[PDB]
Amino acid sequence: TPEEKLLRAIFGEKASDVKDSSLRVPNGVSGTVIDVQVFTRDGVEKDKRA
Amino acid sequence: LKAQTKTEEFDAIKIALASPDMIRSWSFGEVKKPETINYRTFKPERDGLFCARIFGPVKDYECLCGKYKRLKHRGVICEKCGVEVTQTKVRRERMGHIELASPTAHIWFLKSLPSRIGLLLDMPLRDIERVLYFESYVVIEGGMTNLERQQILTEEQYLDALEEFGDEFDAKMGAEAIQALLKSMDLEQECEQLREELNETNSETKRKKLTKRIKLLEAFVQSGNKPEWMILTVLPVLPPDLRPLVPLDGGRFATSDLNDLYRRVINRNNRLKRLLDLAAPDIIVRNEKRMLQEAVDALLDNGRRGRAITGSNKRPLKSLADMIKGKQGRFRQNLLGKRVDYSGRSVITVGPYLRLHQCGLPKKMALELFKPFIYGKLELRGLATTIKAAKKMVEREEAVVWDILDEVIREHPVLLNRAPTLHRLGIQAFEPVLIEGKAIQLHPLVCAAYNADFDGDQMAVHVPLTLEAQLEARALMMSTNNILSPANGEPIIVPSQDVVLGLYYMTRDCVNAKGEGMVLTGPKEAERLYRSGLASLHARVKVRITEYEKDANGELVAKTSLKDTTVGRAILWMIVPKGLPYSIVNQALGKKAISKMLNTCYRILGLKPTVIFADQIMYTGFAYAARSGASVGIDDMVIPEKKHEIISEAEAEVAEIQEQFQSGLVTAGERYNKVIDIWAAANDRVSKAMMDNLQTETVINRDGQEEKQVSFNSIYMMADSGARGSAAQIRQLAGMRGLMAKPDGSIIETPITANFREGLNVLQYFISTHGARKGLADTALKTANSGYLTRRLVDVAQDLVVTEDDCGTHEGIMMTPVIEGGDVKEPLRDRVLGRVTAEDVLKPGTADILVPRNTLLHEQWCDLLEENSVDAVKVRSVVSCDTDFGVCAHCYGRDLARGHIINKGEAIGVIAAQSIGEPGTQLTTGGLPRVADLFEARRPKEPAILAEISGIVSFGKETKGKRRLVITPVDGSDPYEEMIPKWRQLNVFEGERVERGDVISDGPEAPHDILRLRGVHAVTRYIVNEVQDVYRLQGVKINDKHIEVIVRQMLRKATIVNAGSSDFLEGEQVEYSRVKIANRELEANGKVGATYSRDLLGITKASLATESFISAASFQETTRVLTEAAVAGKRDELRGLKENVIVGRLIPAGTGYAYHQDRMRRRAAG
Amino acid sequence: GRTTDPVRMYMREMGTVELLTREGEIDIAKRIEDGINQVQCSVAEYPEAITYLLEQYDRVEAEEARLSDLITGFVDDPELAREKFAELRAQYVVTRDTIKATAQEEILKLSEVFKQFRLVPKQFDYLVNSMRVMMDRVRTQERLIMKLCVEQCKMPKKNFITLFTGNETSDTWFNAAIAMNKPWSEKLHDVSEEVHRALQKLQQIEEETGLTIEQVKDINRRMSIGEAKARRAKKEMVEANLRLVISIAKKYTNRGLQFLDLIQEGNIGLMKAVDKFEYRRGYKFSTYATWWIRQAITRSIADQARTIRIPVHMIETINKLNRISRQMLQEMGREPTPEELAERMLMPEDKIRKVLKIAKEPISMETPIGDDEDSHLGDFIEDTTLELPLDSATTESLRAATHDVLAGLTAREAKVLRMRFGIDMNTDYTLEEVGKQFDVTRERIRQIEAKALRKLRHPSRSEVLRSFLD
Ligand SMILES: [Mg+2]
Ligand SMILES: [Zn+2]
Ligand SMILES: [Zn+2]
Helix, strand or coil, X not given: CHHHHHHXXXXXXXXXXXXXXXXXXXXXXXXXXXXXXXXXXXXCCCCCCC | CCCCCCCCCCCCEECCCCCHXXXXXXXXXXXXXXXXXXXXXXXXXXXXCCCCCCCCCCCCCCCCCCCCCCCCXXXXXXXXXXXXXXXXXXXXXXXXXXXXXXXXXXXXXXXCCCCHHHHHCCCCHHHHHHHHCCCCEEECCCXXXXXXXXXXXXXXXXXXXXXXXXXXXXXXXXXXXXXXXHHHCCHHHHHHHHXXXXXXXCCHHHHHHHHHHHHHHHHHHHHCXXXXXXXXXXXXXXXXXXXXXCEXXXXXXXXXXHHHHHXXXXXXXXXXXXXXXXXXXXXXXXHHHHHHHHHHHHHHCCCCCCCCECCCCCCECCCHHHHHHCCCCCCCCCCCCCCCCCEEEEXXXXXXXXXXXXXXXXXXXXXXXXXXXXXXXXXXXXXXXXXXXXXXXXXXXXCCHHHHHHHHHCCCCEEEEECCCCCHHHEEEEEEEEECCCCEEECHHHHHHHCCCCCCCEEEEECCCCHHHHHHHHXXXXXXXXXXXXXCCCECCCCCCHHHHHHHHHCCCCCCCCCCCCEECCHHHHHHHHHCCCCCCCCEEEEXXXXXXXXXXXXXXXXXXXXXXXXXXXXXXXXXXXXXXXHHCCCCCCHHHHHHHHHHHHHHHCHHXXXXXHHHHHHHHHHXXXXXXXXXXXXXXXXXXXXXXXXXXXXXXXXXXXXXXXXXXXXXXXHHHHHHHHHHHHHHHHHHHHHHHHHHCCXXXXXXXXXXXXXXXXXXXXXXXXXXXXXXXXHHHCCCCCCCECCCCCECCCXXXXXXXCCCCHHHHHHHHHHHHHHHHHHHHHHHHHHHHHHHHHHHCCCCCECCCCCCXXXXXXXXXXXXXXXXXXXXXXXXXXXXXXXXXXXXXXXXXXXXXXXXCCHHHHHHHHHCCCCCEEECCCCCCCCCCCECHHHHCCCCCCCCCCCCCCXXXXXXXXXXXXXXXXXXXXXXXXXXXXXXXXXXXXCCCECCCCEEEEECCCCCCCEEEEEECCCCCCCCEEEECCCCCCCCCCCXXXXXXXXXXXXXXXXXXXXXXXXXXXXXXXXXXXXXXXXXXXXXXXXXXXXXXXXXXXXXXXXXXXXXXCCCCCEEEHHHHHHHHHHHCCCCCCCCCCCEEECCCCHHHHCCCCCCHHHHHHHCCHHHHHHHHHHHCCEECCCCHHHXXXXXXXXXXXXXXXXXXXXXXXXXXX | CCCCCCHHHHHHHHCCCCCCCHHHHHHHHHHHHHHHHHHHHHHHCCHHHHHHHHHHHHHHCCCCCCHHHCEEEECCXXXXXXXXXXXXXXHXXXXXXXXXXXXXXXXXXXXXXXXXXXXXXXXXXXXXXXXXXXXXXXXXXXXXXXXXXHHHCCCCCCCCCCCCCCCCCCHHHHCCCCCCCCCCCHHHHCCHHHHHHHHHHHHHHHHHCCCCHHHHHHHHHHHHHHHHHHHHHXXXXXXXXXXXXXXXXXXXXXXXXXXXXXXHHHHHHHHHHHHHCCHHHCCCHHHHHHHHHHHHHHHHHHHHCCCCCCCHHHHHHHHHHHHHHHHHHHHCCCCCCCCHHHHHCCCCCCHHHHHHHHCCCCEECCCECCCCCCCEHHHHCCCCCCCCHHHHHHHHHHHHHHHHHCCCCCHHHHHHXXXXXXXXXXXXXXXXXXXXXHCCCCHHHHHHHHHHHHHCCCXXXXXXXXXXXX
């Protein structure tokens, strides 16, 4: 909208074409990570970590 | 002043049939295609169930084609595809329509039990359906030839009749036929003719139906509805977002079933149109018409014909009627419940440190709950630049926010609620106290009102957002403002268990203990003596005390003396405020006395002192109980030494009777009864052994050899004080427990000879199991029964609210003590307390008025009545109140959580229903089902009969199945002769005179009778006394008031006898009627006034009639109510609670009563 | 009795109709032939029907139309068409001048050549419609002239039809019959002005249509008769053949359409089958109609049976995938990989994912989940199109923010910045527009903007607006 456009104009920020869907630990629960698994479609290139 | 056009704040509501043009008014376009979305670009296909042109833009302020995307362009209809760019919200609003080829019946008016199309046309249902399916021809406007107007013909018959008469005769078939019938119908002419026919012939059969039908007809005329509208020309389509196509995860879609239905109706409809333009044979187009009828029926209300199933899924698709009805019995989404913001819940804990006016609230909970307040307060003081920054602050949980939360919490109450809300105390307001940890802390004294154990029960919290809610919570729902049950004036704040064991152990006395006999200046040095270990907590001691009595005029007198008391009572006295006498703490202080302490304190010093007193009592109770070191060991349970001997003798008895059965001296059944009797007697013996031993066996020494007092044994103190445990359970612990019963209801003749202190073997335990399971099952069921009962009750009362101040009638019921068969099963003082006198009452001598006409009788007035011997007081009741459409506060009583007279505008029906309903769990023909039977007015199974009229009676005729009874009044005419079946043993004396309402036989009697023969006061007395018998037998305290309001709601309707304005036999409101004959007695006709006869309707029956249809649609059967109202064009004015709750505005009671009143008088006025 | 369930009140209603004998089929078809040919011949006897075809072909060669919009072809290409139309025009230009007894022999032939033309159904329809509308036009004057005498001026209809039949145009009946001194004679004078002026269109019809009011009724009456005969026979045939439709639709049951829907669409198919059938080819009507009915069924199911409509080739594609998945299910012993059926199929083969996804049917929003309780799937679908209050508050706040900071610059910098963006104003303005509104134009304005942005950049100003960007 107009004032957001003015805001971006002054502060020169590129508002991303991407939104953050990242999985974050649910509120209030705290613990230590004991494992991670990565399932991939057969034929898609496995990423670095996986 | 120009009235208005656009939105005002509306009053009432109207419902009626819909014209084709009226249906077109709502419609913003015709949906011409079954298509939903394009299948790739998911945009709506134009002219389909989902359409941007007809309904609205897919996204906010944006055209479908995308040409006008700017928020500036608004009222613009796009030149490409007309879509007015406006918020997508309007896709939740805008309706549509479909123009049907052939006419179609509306299933609601075809299949409603009294079929509307049917009885409007005076035509049977099966005929109408037979005509709709093209299974026969029906005549319309037959003219004069051979034939009736509504007559039905077959193929061959229609042909022959057509060959004979070409014109001046008419017949059609299918929907068009029925519509032709309804349109041709002239209601007025029918009215005239039916009035004439009514007048001419005398037969009950004829004129009953005649008058019923004429009434129906003129009603439908006055409605504004024209019959044709029962046949659908145009079919409205529901807005898209109310039946959405919205996407899911995995790219999957999900949609309402209505689409599947609507689509069908469209397809077939369109197909039918095609079949017209292709000139198809009749057999085809007919089938298509029937199919269209079926599709429309399935759309509107599914299940009244075929129950169509949804695509690929067996489960029947949900139709619009099923959308309206909802489910979980009768619940309309206000009724079942609604999710609410600013709320929470969790496991609850104790928190004895709390004052009675507060509660422990978990920090995190209070943080998330008050979040907007916190945001606003953070930038109010300028600790946060903007709202966003405030969010980031509290989300970071910066240290500074906790203090701000301490600010927003202070004066700002929160509502606490428990799971089974029964009476109004199920929700109470508290002051939040910020507490670390995730559990809610709840004041112990309140634990009674919630019926909340600590075993993991959870409670919910609600935040009172608006200012009015803060003040409502603080001045109404506040904890300290309800100290008394609305059911009875007794304190609900009564100390529960630990505390009462504390005060019990505190004031009690043993025979010999440290400090016995000495004397002390005052309670201070008594406590000083105790804590230092010099003097025992319980010892007989004289101490000087100063008590107070306010018995002067509003003024506290003081007096000092040497009281013979104990150390404990002395220490405890420090707590007792002001004008209470020392007499109250000088006793043993059981759970019963400790209650009357608070009660007297309330009726004397007022509210605040009672509150602070109660708090102190709790604190000291816990403290001293903790000091006492009370415990429970295995040796705390003492078995009688004589048990085994009792068992042995009683065991000899059974083998004696057995030996008698072996020799035939006694029959099997008589044997059984005998053995069972001896075992029962044995059980009683052991019980009264262990009771003596456990109770008095402490045998101790003071200065001499011996003496014996009541035991200091733990479990005994527990059971005696009223803390926990009772003689029955104690009896189960030490002495043998009972004789159990096999499932069929018989009782096993070999009881449980062991107990819990000893071991139970295999058999005894297995037999105990049944008793256990039946216990759990029965209680868990009685919960449901109670709930159902409260439901029926609030349904029958509800809208009853205190409206006027004083109706000013001398009328009332005579209040006497209940005096049952023994001495006084309940006194006069309890029955008349807090009520108001109907007229001034005498001393034994007169021209001396103790209580002057109508005055609230409080404790002092009742005690003044008690000083004198007065045995009888006439008292105003809610049943006799002259006020119409409510109760005057003057007729109700004072009763509330406060001792003052009932406020103007409090809704009494609801609290009455709740007051009757809450204790219902504790109830066990007799019992809770007996109560339900009572309030339902149900005629018993084998009832008695009361004399129809006074005077000498005799027996007449002979045995036909009835031997007639002939009554002979002294002066008046004889002709009353009642047919009494003679195989029922009579009572009435063949040679004696019987008053009307005497016993002509035995057995219980239907209260319809009692109302008719004995009278209104008589019947209300019967109901109240019987239901009170049921409750009081269980030890339940319920004031007669609530029951009386329920009764008043039961008798709301009556049936006229005489005439001169309205119809003869009509059941109708006595409010309406009495206000009409009070109006008629003067002016009008000089007096044309009509006599009525009061009627008795059961609660579930009385709840049926409600002026407001929106209210009825809630708890009754929705479909029928909606139809039956829609025909008469009934106009709901609201005015009640349920309806206003549904529509979502202020309740016409309590705080809201000021608004509605101000609105109610503005209405129908200048 | 009638158990309702409209399948039954159909099944029993059609079951009355007796099956056709092999001879009866030929009888009925013959009846059809008779009927239609009557309306065709009746069309051939209309002058306007000819002249119209002429005026249309003159428009075809003038490039105002195409040969496809007039003829579907004759009994029997553009050249052959040109010369056939030349034949038509020829017989027309002879028959026209011979109207002076002998003419009939050619007027009979004029029909014949016109009968060689097989018209587009639309064109034929336009013709017949025009005829019946012309008959409406005749009826207007007949009923006007009737009511102006009988109802208004009080004349019996018994004597009204005497001088009517055979003429109904000239003044023999109107001006020579009012002097007859009948009780109804002198009464005819009041309305005379209104009758004789309305006689204009009446006598005009015999000019336009080239037929006396006599023939105009006869011709299209015969046409009406023919049409009636036709429809009668065809209907008869369809009603006879419903059983076949029922037998065929029992194959297609669970494809996602109701039984009666199926049999109705199939019935439409059978109607088309009767419409297009020719018994002269010796092809049995049963096996000929089967194809049409099956066609209606399948073609309908493809079109309307989905909550989401999909094109035909897509559907067929999906089915094609299913076929492979069947063999390959046990053949692979597990199931073909998601890309396995892809190589088996012609097209780019990554389309498996898209096609397989879009093919799925939406789940009933009333689908029950858990407890059997009133929780139903739709109750769990949240509104994602809404806007959080925690945001809206910040919108309303940001307004106060930028509005505050816009009071911090010179009124012209404020005007230029409120202009350059949509702030509290409709749309927003191009930097040239801003120049014309300010009278100071081009590069100049942009400069101010920069400095404006510059003043808000270094913080006293910046501290309030900076907290807005997360
Ligand atoms: Mg519990
Ligand atoms: Zn557009
Ligand atoms: Zn009253």
